[PDB]
Amino acid sequence: NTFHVDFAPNTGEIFAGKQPGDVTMFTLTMGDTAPHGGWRLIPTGDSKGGYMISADGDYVGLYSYMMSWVGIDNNWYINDDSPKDIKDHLYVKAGTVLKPTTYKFTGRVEEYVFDNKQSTVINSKDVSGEVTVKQGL
Numbered sequence: 001n002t003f004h005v006d007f008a009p010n011t012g013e014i015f016a017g018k019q020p021g022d023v024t025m026f027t028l029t030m031g032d033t034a035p036h037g038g039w040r041l042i043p044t045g046d047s048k049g050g051y052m053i054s055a056d057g058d059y060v061g062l063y064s065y066m067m068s069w070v071g072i073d074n075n076w077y078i079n080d081d082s083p084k085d086i087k088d089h090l091y092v093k094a095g096t097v098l099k100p101t102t103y104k105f106t107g108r109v110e111e112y113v114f115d116n117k118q119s120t121v122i123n124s125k126d127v128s129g130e131v132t133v134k135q136g137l
């Protein structure tokens with residue numbers, strides 16, 4: 001089926017400290033050419049509520065560009081009817097302190113349709129990814 005999703009950690013190195021600017025932790029690309037109503041990311045496990053979890057026991061908040069956070073529902077969502085693959089990124093807010101360790105994210109992605117118009121889930125995939133933060137000496 002034409003539904004597809006790519007959840008990948010960012011290739012570039014991340015450095016421990018107060019992040020100098022917005023830094024992408026993960027890249028998320030999902031799409032379908034044939035009809036649907038929208039898309040959502042439901043964080044799972046210890047990612048509950050939009051969080052990366054460190055091997056030091058720290059949660060760090062993830063933010064989105066394309067989608068919008070609904071905490072009442074614990075999901076990022078975006079409503080769009082179009083074939084164009086959605087280019088979205090999970091990132092950390094500037095000034096966010098990162099520690100030189102391994103940050104994990106688990107979730108599941110869902111696709112839907114509106115009739116009428118309340119969410120019916122057409123597809124799901126379980127995304128996950130990790131990013132290991134380097135150090136500045």
Ligand SMILES: OC[C@H]1O[C@@H](O)[C@H](O)[C@@H](O)[C@H]1O
Pocket residue numbers: 038040070073075077078079119
């Ligand atoms: O486009 C409808 C959306 O409404 C939001 O409130 C909800 O959190 C999403 O899961 C989705 O149902």
Ligand SMILES: C[N+](C)(C)CCOP(=O)(O)O
Pocket residue numbers: 049050051059060061062063069093
């Ligand atoms: C934005 N969030 C509520 C999903 C995560 C929390 O972010 P922050 O409290 O780490 O800034």
Ligand SMILES: [Cl-]
Pocket residue numbers: 062063064067068069
């Ligand atoms: Cl957000």
